[PDB]
Amino acid sequence: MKKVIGSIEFGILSPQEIRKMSAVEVTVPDTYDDDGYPIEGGVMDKRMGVIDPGLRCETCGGRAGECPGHFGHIELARPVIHVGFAKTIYRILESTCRECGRIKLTDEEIEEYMKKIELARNRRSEFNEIIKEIHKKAKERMVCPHCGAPQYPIKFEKPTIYWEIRKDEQGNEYRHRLMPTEVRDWLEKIPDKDLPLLGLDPEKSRPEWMVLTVLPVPPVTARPSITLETGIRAEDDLTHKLVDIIRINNRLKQNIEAGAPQLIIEDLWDLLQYHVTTYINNEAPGVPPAKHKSGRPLKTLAQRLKGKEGRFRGNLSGKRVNFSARTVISPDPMISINEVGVPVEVAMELTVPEKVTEFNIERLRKMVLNGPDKYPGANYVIDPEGRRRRIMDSNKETLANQLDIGWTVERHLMDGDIVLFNRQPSLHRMSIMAHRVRVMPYRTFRLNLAVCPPYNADFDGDEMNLHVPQTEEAQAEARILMEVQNHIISPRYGGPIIGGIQDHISGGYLLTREGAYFTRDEVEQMLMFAGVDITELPEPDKYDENGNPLWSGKTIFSLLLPEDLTVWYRNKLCDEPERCEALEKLIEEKLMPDPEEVRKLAYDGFVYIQNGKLLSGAIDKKAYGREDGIILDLIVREYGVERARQFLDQVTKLTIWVITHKGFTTGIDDEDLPEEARDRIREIIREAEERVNKLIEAYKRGELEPLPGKSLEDTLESLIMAVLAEARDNAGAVAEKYLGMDNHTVIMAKTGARGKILNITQMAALLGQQSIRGKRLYRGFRGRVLSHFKPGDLGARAKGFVVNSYKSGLTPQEYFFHAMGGREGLVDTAVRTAQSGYMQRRLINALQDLKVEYDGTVRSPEGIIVQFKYGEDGVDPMKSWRGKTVDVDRIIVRTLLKMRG
C-alpha cells in the first residue's frame, strides 16, 4: 500500500488544471480578522486549510497540524507575463512567423535538426547549443517560408516589456509595445510539431501557458503567520503580496467594467504585472525590490527556494542525531577485533528498543524489574497501543507482571548489541564500521589495536563517535554489511589493511628469532594467554643443560597456523641473497623437501611454511603487517573471514605476551658508535666540505659549465645539493654498517615495526642538508642567512648544512636551520589537508551516482552507459589478489601440493 516515487517529470501548469485543482476562488483581500478568525473569501480562508488552533478545515475537515492545506486560485483580469519565462517568450517570438506562427525554417533544415536533437536529447549542454543555433538561424530570417509575410523585428526590454519595431508608410522605425494578449495570440497558433525544435514539449509545457491567466494561491501552511512577541499576527510576505494582488486585480476589473480610458487600464495592467513579478521574484533583474512594512525587501517565492539554508541546500546538513555519544579512546588488546568497550554511563543512556516475544520475555522482565538505575535495566516501556511510560521506582514492581507479547521495552545496551563507530575526518569507506558492545567500567571507548590503521587513530587524545541503530532493518544491515571482519582487505589496493602495527611485529620477530627457546612454564602460559585451544604440549626441541625441556619459537607459532597452509617468500631481513638462492633452489627442485634438509639450510630471511609448520624464516612486517601481509591475505582468501579473525586475535595476544615477558626497551646507548665509525664519519664530512669549497672556487674564477636547464648559479646549487645528499647517504651507510642487529632500535627499524633507517642516520651520524621548497636556505639578511656569516658566502656550512647528529647536539646556527626546515614541514602538512579535501569533495560530487546494474553494466544517472562489464573484467578490487584478477600461480602451487601430498 506504500509505493515509492520512481520519477518526477516537470512541466508547465495549464489554466484549466489550476482552476480545477484549486478549491476556493479568492476575491476579497481579507486578513486574519480582529478575532483571529479566517474571513470568507480572504487570503486565509478555511478551504485553504487552517493553521490557527481550535477550528476545522473547510475542504478536508482537518484540525491544525493534521490538515495539509489546499490550493486556491485568483482569476486575473488581464494576461500577465511570467518573469521566469520572459526570455523564453522573447526567444520564441523571434523564431515564429507573426501571421502563421510556424517556425521560420525549411523542411530539410527541420528534418536535420530533428535528427540531431533526437541524437543529443540526453546531453543537456548540447541540447541547449542546438536550441541556440536554431534560434539564431530563425531570428536571422526575415521572410516566412510559408506565408512570405514580413516579420518586423521584436525587441525585448527587461523585465517583461516587448517592442515590435515596425516601419510606417514613411519608412521610420517606431517601437510598438506588445501587450500580453498579443503575445498569447501569437503563441497559441504555434503547432505541436514545431515545439520540439523550438525547445518545448507539447504535452507538459505549452507556450500559451507561460503567460499567466490564473494565479494559484499557496495554502496557509505554506504561508503561515508566525505571530510576534507582542501577540501581533506577523503575517507572511506572500500574504501581503497576495493582498496587494487581489486589491489591484479588483481595481483593474472594476475600471475595465466601467468603460475607463485606455491609459488608466494600462496603468493598472502594468501595476498588476509589476506586483506579480515582484511576488514571484523580489530580486528579478530590472525590478525594484518591494519593501516590507519595515522598509526591507520582502522574501518571496524565489527567495524562499534559492537559499543555502532553504529547502534546497538546507535539508542536507549535519545536526545532532539521536542516540549518539562521543568520548576519548584508550587501547586494549584483550577484546576481539570486532568488539568495542563502552562505558557503563553511556550504556545506561543509549537505549535500544526491543519488542518482547515468547523467547525473550523473562530477560526483559528482569531488565524492567532492574529499573533505570541498575545497569541491566530499562528506561521506557511502550504498551501495544502506543503510550510510553518511564519505569522509575513507583511503578517498577508493576509493568513487569503486565508485560506480555506485543509490548516494547527500551532496555539498556548489553553485550552483543551492534553499534557503529566513526572517526572524523571520515576519508574512506573504512572510517565507519560496526562493532559488538562489551560494557566495561570507567569512561573511554576501548578499541583493539589491530583496528587502529583503518581508523587512522592514535591514543593521544583522539575522540570517536558511536551511533546505535534502532530499527531491526538497520541493525541487520550493520551486522551483515558493516562488521569489522568483512573489511580486512582494503578496497583501495586489494591488500590487507587490518593487522599488527608496532608490538605485533617486534614481538613476533622476538618469538621467531633464530636461536630463541622457551621453557615449559612460558610455553604453557603464553598458549593459555593467547586463547589457543590446546591440551598437550608437542615434543620438546632441545634440552636445557640441567635437563629441563625447551621449545623453539617456530613450533609455538606453528601451533596457530592451519593444518594445510603452505607458502614461501622473502622477508625484509634478507641480507645474504646466496642462502635465499639455495633455499629457493631446493624448494623449486622438489616442491616438498624433507623437513630435515630444510633445517640445515634454515635462514631467518626466508620464510617457508610446510603443512602449517614454520620451518625457516622469522616474522616481520611482510607476515601480517599493515600491507603486504602474505600470511594474513592467504588466510583471508582461502579459509574464510572467521578463521582469519580467530588467527589475528590469537597471534596478537601471543606476540604481546612474548614481548611483555621477554623484555624490550631502548636507551641512550642504542645510538652509541665506536670510535672508528666516528672518525670515518668525520673524514667523510670534511671531504664533502672540501669538495664543496672547490666547487665554489671554480664558480668564483669563472670555471663552470652551465647546463642548458640552469644558469651558472642554479647549476652550482644543483651540484652542491647533489654532493651533500650523497655525503649524507654515505654517512648513513657507515652508521648502519657499524650498528648490530642485536640493538633494539635496529630491530625496530629493520623489521618495519616503527621508524626508518634515516631516523638512525640522523640520530647517530649526521643530520644533513636543510632545505626550503627544495632549495638551499637563502631567506635572511642581504647576502647571508644569519648575521654570523661573512656576506656573500656560499659554503656548505653557511647555508643550512648541519654536521651534528642529535646525540652530539646542534650548535645555535644549526638549530635555527633545523627550525626553518621543521616550520616548512608543518606548513605543508597544514595546507595539504585542505587541498586534498577540496579535491575529494569534487570527485565525490562527480562520481557518487555510478553503480553496477544487474547485467554488469555501469550506467550514468541520466541513463548513459559508462562502462560495459565494470573494470573491463568484472572483478571487484577487494576480491582481486593484488590487482590481478586471478593469481593462477598460487592456485597451481596450492592445488599441486594438496593433491600430491
Binding site: 635555527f816 626553518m820 608543518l826 597544514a830
Partner: protein, 102 residues
C-alpha cells in the same frame, strides 16, 4: 632576520601556524623620541638640505624615518660619528643608523 627577535619554535599548529609569533627573551621593542630634535642633529652634522642641492652619483642620500632630508659626502664617516655620539651618551639609544654601499 628573526634571530633574537622572534622565538623560532613556539607557534600554534593548524591554520595559524607561522602567522602567530612570540617575542624572544632578549627582544626589546622601542618607543619614539621627538623627531625634530633628531632632524636638528643631522642638520648640525653637516647634511645640506635637499632644497640647496640635488642627488648626484657622487653624493650620499640621507633618510630619516624613511623621508629624504638632504645629501652628504663620505657617509661612512657620518655613520661612524653618529654611532660614536650614541655610545658616548650624547643622544638616546633609540637612534639606529645603517648605510648601504651599493
Amino acid at each position: 632576520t628573526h634571530w633574537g627577535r622572534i622565538c623560532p619554535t613556539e607557534t600554534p599548529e593548524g591554520p595559524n601556524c607561522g602567522l602567530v609569533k612570540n617575542l624572544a627573551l632578549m627582544a626589546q621593542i622601542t618607543t619614539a623620541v621627538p623627531e625634530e630634535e633628531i632632524r636638528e642633529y643631522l642638520m648640525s652634522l653637516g647634511i645640506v638640505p635637499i632644497e640647496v642641492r640635488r642627488p648626484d652619483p657622487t653624493l650620499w642620500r640621507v633618510y630619516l624615518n624613511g623621508v629624504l632630508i638632504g645629501t652628504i659626502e663620505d657617509g661612512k664617516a657620518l655613520v661612524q660619528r653618529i654611532r660614536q655620539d650614541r655610545r658616548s651618551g650624547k643622544i638616546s639609544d633609540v637612534i639606529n643608523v645603517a648605510y648601504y654601499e651599493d
